[PDB]
Design a protein around this ligand. Structure first.
Ligand code: BT8
Ligand code: BT8
Ligand code: BT8
Lengths: 237, 280, 36, 251, 237, 280, 36, 237, 280, 36
């Protein structure tokens, strides 16, 4: 018998270990793999797909589909805010989205985010909007001037419905926390660059949709259980 | 050269950000149509003047193997041991599902189909209800569809002539063993849009029927009342999955069904309301 | 430095966690492009 | 090509309708080799005086017959030199060619299963602590008829349950044993050649029967003919028979 | 003493393990192997031998030999069913047979099945029968037309008593369950293609025997205890 | 190249199904005579137009080694420990058979002769009948034919000078050891068509006599009443078998005899009756 | 990949489960053919 | 610390194991071996030496030296038995002898046995005896004819006192049990081939001695404790 | 080529039996004179017509190493623990002999002189006489001739500064250790035809004096009455022996003496009487 | 196949059971022959 010496940790069940273990079904030969389309190798494949942000989370629109669109008015000639969003990604509203829910399965955050916007108004309706990400260490911008001084994209609605802008990863440290709580990653704020113009006899109001995905940039680390789902009771057999 | 590159956890790397310059052109990469069903191609360097940064970050941890490859509890079986001639009772039976505990269920339900070998790990605990405990040995036998199901602490089927059983006794460390991917098809179904031959039982009920996990206390009649609670833990090893689906938004009602509705309770997502949309 | 690994068991499934191999998309989620 | 002629001793058998023939377990009978042997004395090998066709007393197949069996070497107990060689030595080994014969008309129908089963250890007739008595598994050439009657000494009798293969096993799985079917519309003879088979190189011809021949009709014999009753005859020839440890004659 | 670290599973008795173990009879030299005819290396060798199916399982024929034959009548001119069988192999009636009993020692099922039929009637009697396997997702065929639309063999009784037909492995998935219970593998149904014809003065009724084995095709997996045998009491010493 | 090919469990393969074509000919492969005693040669491609399918399936698990190579219970020995000067009693004796527990018995009785080495595994459990247990050590000694059989917890034979004994004490893990194939002949007899020198005791009784397994509690007189139940488990290693027989159709009555008849009970197979044969 | 195996004991029987070798019939159950 | 996994059997004391174990007297250097005549390497060396069989075990001769000789008479003209012996070797009478006592330390039996006989009568006395081994499956021979039909040696007393005959290993199975109890290995029976002839004035009665050893043939296996010795009380310090 | 040939246990083989033929000659191999002191040379083939048989049998198991190389009990030491200030008592002392237990004693006494290394194995068992046990640790010290012999559970000699001691505590597995062949001469004497300098103490008493095995309970004064029974087991390793002697025919009386006589009991061998010598 | 053996200890006696070497009589028990 070989002299051997036992070490701290032995006997212990650690959830995240990987060790070998006798197979209970020896000699069993598993079914052929076959070809199924759409294999996922890596979670980031999902974070990289456009998901719709529940931008309108008011108590009034909550459980409808209208939570997913914002409304623009021809009634307004003005530098008015339309909406704003915390940019951290496990944050509300964006936590519900693909990239959020997944980020919510990790404790660490980094990359650039791709916000794309689709204008759903009449083919003959036109507007120019300002889309702005204001970096952290300051308050959510209260005016068009204040917002525009940051990173922005002026969007002109025309033949192509859509535009994508990006919030660069700009941060003190290489990674960020998915549940920061006090610290912010910045804001993204939408304004009227001109006005929503309409012809005769066409709807005065038009909607706007909002999407997020990650860039090549994006990465998550330190896997943790998700905060966006729970089990209250017991589950029926 | 891959014993090294994965010891500091660096295979699978994130691209660098390149420097970028003032653009003036007819090429509008920021402008696409999301109507196509295609996600935009724009990258930081396309819409803003960026610097060169060498990105050291790693996707290893985000791999399917990292994500499913942690064990979590899929079942809790309580054995309340009676002494009413002791042999008529005192056994668990559990039909085998990843579906009765929400945390791991949500994770695998991120995909439509999944395939993998399994590592089952057991955490038995004896709650002592008498002055003492004595010597408790337990038996856990896997009873695949069609195998004889034990009806008493008694019956012959614990002979386990060809079945796999594993034994635990107080003071022994947590049992563990591996399973080979067991489905009859090429992958496990996390969801099923069909019924049985009889046109009944919509859903996963039909697909993966692994049979049952049966528990019995094997130590012969004795005087101490105890309870034994063995918790079952499951790690996925060697994993592939296909067709990502959106993540479960609501509490789980029932196994093998997507039913979300609950009695006299408002239907409640994890989204959180705001007073007004111009303020974050 | 680096690390040592042997499989001690007769069956596939006993083996520990698999090694990682590249994302190698193809872009089939993000761009499944019929005319590229 | 449905013809067969097998010559063994000074004996030759003929059958004009047969289904091939079967060699048990795919091995032809042979003499016992130096590598496998145990008993260190020179065996005696009677050759033609021993390995020849011995044909036993015939049995009658009727509308009511539900089966029969014989045990080997036992059935040959009183047959010629093979017999005498059997009780003069402790040990013997032999293979056999078994040829079962039943003929009828193109106007009869019936079907027999002919099986040669190794170590056929039959079952006691009753419950509890009974066993089977030596005499009842050593009938000689006459064999056991399955009879519905009450019998002499029942605690010693074997079961009469033939569809249980007498062994408590389902008839009709009786096939994994070397076998043929005699089916009157098709054939006339059944023929089986068997090698010595046993977990020992030679055994006692007296206290152990290596084989049992069992024929039970799985299709009842039906006819409109005047002869509504026909005989089945067994002839078996030992092959490469050898004996050793000679002494006086056991009775 | 070498530093070493203990792993989950240790101490455990697993029925299906194979590890080494000290021999309690050291130096003992076992008896010579010798040649015995009829070695079996693999269980499938048995599944490949024709066994008789207890096709007539009525309460009336049960413990006889007549459970093993079916009876044909010259009295009938008609497209009548003769009998039918569930085709799953651990199923009744075929569970009792070689291939069934063995399949009953495993939980998984695949291959093609060989059903052979021997006609035991008078040498001068003649018939033509239809033998049909109707694949799953439909009910047992109620009529000759319905049955024949599936996989079949029309059998003509003549000099050779016997015919073998085969139920191809045709199934959704590569393997099937030996105890399916709700799901079916299909049916095999026997009918009169013509009529059982007889001369003067020959029995009006003739019997029919039925056999199963597996094809080269056939395989079983995941060993489990058998359902076709039990131990009620205790066994006497 | 066989460390690899058996790690994914692929030596021993199943043939492919070839494509097949409309046949018109004098060659009738479907037509044979089962009277020959020969099983038919027909294959799917012979009677039906088949496609080409590459068969990945494996017979490994169906091998004799896989099938007998799982341990199951062959005996249960209960030791009720008395204190009536404690030394007059308190020992098991068991004559060694694979024949007293039905599940493994049925499996090996699938063959006429069998040969193999054995792995015996022990699962002792102390049922505590007093307020406590204390220190229980047990001894298990193999006592081959002719060796002196212990008549008391006392007697010298537990000295075990040349016999093999194995010791277990509470808290120690399940004992195990291996045996070399022990018969005096080339294989073990599962069935025997012969009697003893005295023309008595039909059957296996005669053949394999391994002697006996003897148990004793070795801890000296003490105060706690307990019961010790050691269950014996047996795996076959290194296996060959010959001459397959049909499987046992009925419950087992008695060891070493094929007797199936039972008192005042109908004789009951595992076959199941139907109402009528034209309906499945 | 593949796997490692050594025998640690002096006696045949101590060794673990045997390796598999081909069915290689001969057809002696299904076709023991006297004229083939 | 190296990951390692504990196996069934561990902790166990098995009498027949051989494993290593720390030496409690490290560095100790044992005394020189020297040459002593008569080393034994193997037990069979002993089984191969002639030992005297206690052929006359009657209650009347028991604890004397006369248990070891048989007496021949000139008074008898006849085919009379002289004595007989069970041939199994752990059997009575031969269990007491070298080869027996040792065989009694094993459970398994095989080989040929060498029975040698020394005639102790007057130099001028003469006889011819028949020595016969009758193989198993029959009863001990009751008559000279019956005995002689087996394996025999006709012994003629003359200048050389002694003769050795051998019982060949003749048996069903390669080995036999040393404690068979019901089964026999055969018998060895001694008769008068002629008569014990004497001159005038010389003793009318003459003795006969009997020896056993094993042949090159002989082997024992499966070591077990001996049945020919016991410990009733305790042994004094 | 000897890792292999001894794994199936085949070095040391038995000769084959050759074929033999009818002899007619002046050469009488069956005829010898046993008066010479020589055992006969005759072989089966000499006196009977024999066949050729290839003998596969093996003498390995019959080797001196196989026969002595199994452990058996040589001593049983009971420690009855008192609490009468606990330190005045509670120690074993045993003078070391292979002579106090008959089974192994008979085996080694098959030879006149023997030489070998020893493996001592311990089987301690605590018989609990109180409601409980607590923590029992034991010490076993080897005290060679001349070393100070402990007179109390107390005394300094358990310091064991240069002596070898081994410790056991409840729940620890059976202690074991090896000894090198300890005699002062070239071999151990199993028998001695001589006396001491004083012309006294006939026999082995004189020869092998190993000193003593001393046991003590080391756990300090406590409340539970218990008994500890440690049984000593001994395997011979690396063995030679010389000059075989006939085996002991009668029960053993006393150690170190061949005395067989017992008071008021008939002197009783293992031979068994017959009614008459013409019947077996 | 074959088997692996190392000695783990510094002293002769610790080593396990010895290997077997041939009987090689000489016939000194059975035939110690002064004129052969
Ligand atoms: C003697 C020990 O036996 C066992 N104790 O605990 C055990 C646990 C076992 O299952 C392993 C993991 C399986 C669970 C089945 N499962 C699925 C399948 C389909 C769906 C829709 N959801 N989940 C996929 C993987 C198997 C055996 C034992
Ligand atoms: C110190 C430990 O001693 C033992 N404890 O438990 C033990 C179990 C043992 O038997 C090993 C398996 C054997 C059983 C005998 N058996 C047969 C033989 C013939 C028939 C007809 N049926 N079964 C074949 C294999 C041997 C020794 C011990
Ligand atoms: C700290 C442990 O100390 C010990 N515990 O148990 C022990 C046992 C020991 O003896 C080892 C075997 C010896 C016994 C002496 N013996 C003899 C010698 C001559 C005769 C005529 N008969 N037998 C030869 C071999 C030595 C030390 C300890």
């Amino acid at each position: 018998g070989l002299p051997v010496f036992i070490t701290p940790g032995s006997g212990q069940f650690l959830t995240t270990d990987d060790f070998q273990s006798p197979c209970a079904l020896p000699w069993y030969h598993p079914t052929k793999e076959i070809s199924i389309p759409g294999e996922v190798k890596n979670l980031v494949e999902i974070c990289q797909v456009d998901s719709l942000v529940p931008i309108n989370n008011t108590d009034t629109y909550i459980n409808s589909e209208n939570m997913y669109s914002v409304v623009l008015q021809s009634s307004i000639n003005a530098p008015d805010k339309i909406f704003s969003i915390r940019t951290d990604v496990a944050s509300q509203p964006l936590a519900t989205t693909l990239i959020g829910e997944i980020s919510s399965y990790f404790t660490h955050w980094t990359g650039s985010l791709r916000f794309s916007f689709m204008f759903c108004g009449t083919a003959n309706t036109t507007v120019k909007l300002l889309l702005a990400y204001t970096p952290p260490g300051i308050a959510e911008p209260t005016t068009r001037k204040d917002a525009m001084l940051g990173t922005h994209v002026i969007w002109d609605v025309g033949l192509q419905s859509t535009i994508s802008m990006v919030v660069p990863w700009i941060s003190a440290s290489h990674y960020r926390n998915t549940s920061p709580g006090r610290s912010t990653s910045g804001y993204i704020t939408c304004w009227y660059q001109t006005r929503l113009v309409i012809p005769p006899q066409t709807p005065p109001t038009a909607r706007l949709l909002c999407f997020v995905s990650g860039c090549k940039d994006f990465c998550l680390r330190m896997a943790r259980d998700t905060n966006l789902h729970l089990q209250s009771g017991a589950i029926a057999q | 050269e891959n014993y090294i590159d994965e010891v500091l956890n660096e295979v699978l790397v994130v691209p660098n950000i390149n420097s970028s310059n003032p653009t003036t052109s007819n090429s509008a990469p920021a402008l696409d149509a999301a109507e196509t069903g295609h996600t935009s191609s724009v990258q930081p360097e396309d819409v803003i003047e960026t610097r060169y940064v060498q990105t050291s970050q790693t996707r290893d941890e985000m791999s399917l193997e990292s994500f499913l490859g942690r064990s979590g509890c899929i079942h809790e079986s309580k054995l309340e041991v009676t002494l009413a001639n002791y042999n008529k009772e005192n056994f668990t039976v559990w039909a085998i599902n990843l579906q009765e505990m929400a945390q791991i269920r949500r994770k695998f339900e991120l995909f439509t189909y999944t395939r993998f070998d399994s590592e089952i790990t057991l955490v038995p605990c004896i709650s002592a209800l008498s002055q003492d405990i004595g010597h408790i040995t337990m038996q856990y036998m896997y009873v695949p569809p069609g195998a004889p199901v034990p009806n008493s602490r008694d019956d012959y089927a614990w002979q386990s002539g060809t079945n796999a059983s594993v034994f635990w006794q107080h003071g022994q460390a947590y049992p563990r063993f591996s399973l080979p991917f067991l489905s009859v098809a090429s992958a496990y179904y996390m969801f099923y849009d069909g019924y049985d031959e009889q046109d009944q039982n919509y859903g996963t009920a039909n697909t993966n029927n692994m049979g049952s996990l049966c528990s019995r206390i094997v130590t012969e009649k004795h005087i101490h009342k105890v309870h034994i609670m063995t918790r079952i833990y499951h790690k996925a090893k060697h994993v592939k999955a296909w067709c990502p689906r959106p993540p479960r938004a609501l509490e789980y009602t029932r196994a093998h069904r997507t039913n979300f509705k609950i009695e006299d309770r408002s239907i409640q997502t994890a989204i959180v309301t705001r007073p007004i949309i111009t303020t974050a | 430095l680096n690390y040592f690994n042997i499989n001690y068991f007769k069956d596939a499934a006993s083996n520990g966690a698999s090694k990682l191999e590249f994302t190698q998309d193809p872009s089939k989620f993000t761009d499944p492009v019929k005319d590229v | 090509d449905r013809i067969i002629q097998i010559t063994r001793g000074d004996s030759t058998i003929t059958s004009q309708d047969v289904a091939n023939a079967i060699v048990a377990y795919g091995v032809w009978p042979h003499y016992l080799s130096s590598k496998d042997a145990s008993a260190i004395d020179k065996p005696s090998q009677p050759d033609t005086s021993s390995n020849r066709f011995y044909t036993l007393r015939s049995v009658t197949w009727s509308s009511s017959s539900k089966g029969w069996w014989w045990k080997l070497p036992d059935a040959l107990k009183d047959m010629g030199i093979f017999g005498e060689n059997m009780f003069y030595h402790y040990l013997g080994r032999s293979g056999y060619t078994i040829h079962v014969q039943c003929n009828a008309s193109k106007f009869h129908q019936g079907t027999l299963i002919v099986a040669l089963i190794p170590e056929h250890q039959i079952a006691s007739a009753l419950h509890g602590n009974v066993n089977v008595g030596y005499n009842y598994t050593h009938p000689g050439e006459t064999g056991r008829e399955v009879k519905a009657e009450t019998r002499l000494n029942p605690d010693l009798q074997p079961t009469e349950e033939y569809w249980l293969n007498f062994d408590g096993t389902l008839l009709g799985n009786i096939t994994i044993f070397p076998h043929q079917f005699i089916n009157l519309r098709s054939n006339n003879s059944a023929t089986i050649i068997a090698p010595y088979v046993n977990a020992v190189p030679m055994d006692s011809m007296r206290s152990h029967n290596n084989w049992s021949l069992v024929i039970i009709p799985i299709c009842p014999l039906e006819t409109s003919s005047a002869i509504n009753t026909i005989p089945i005859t067994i002839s078996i020839s030992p092959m490469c028979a050898e004996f050793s440890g000679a002494r006086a004659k056991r009775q």
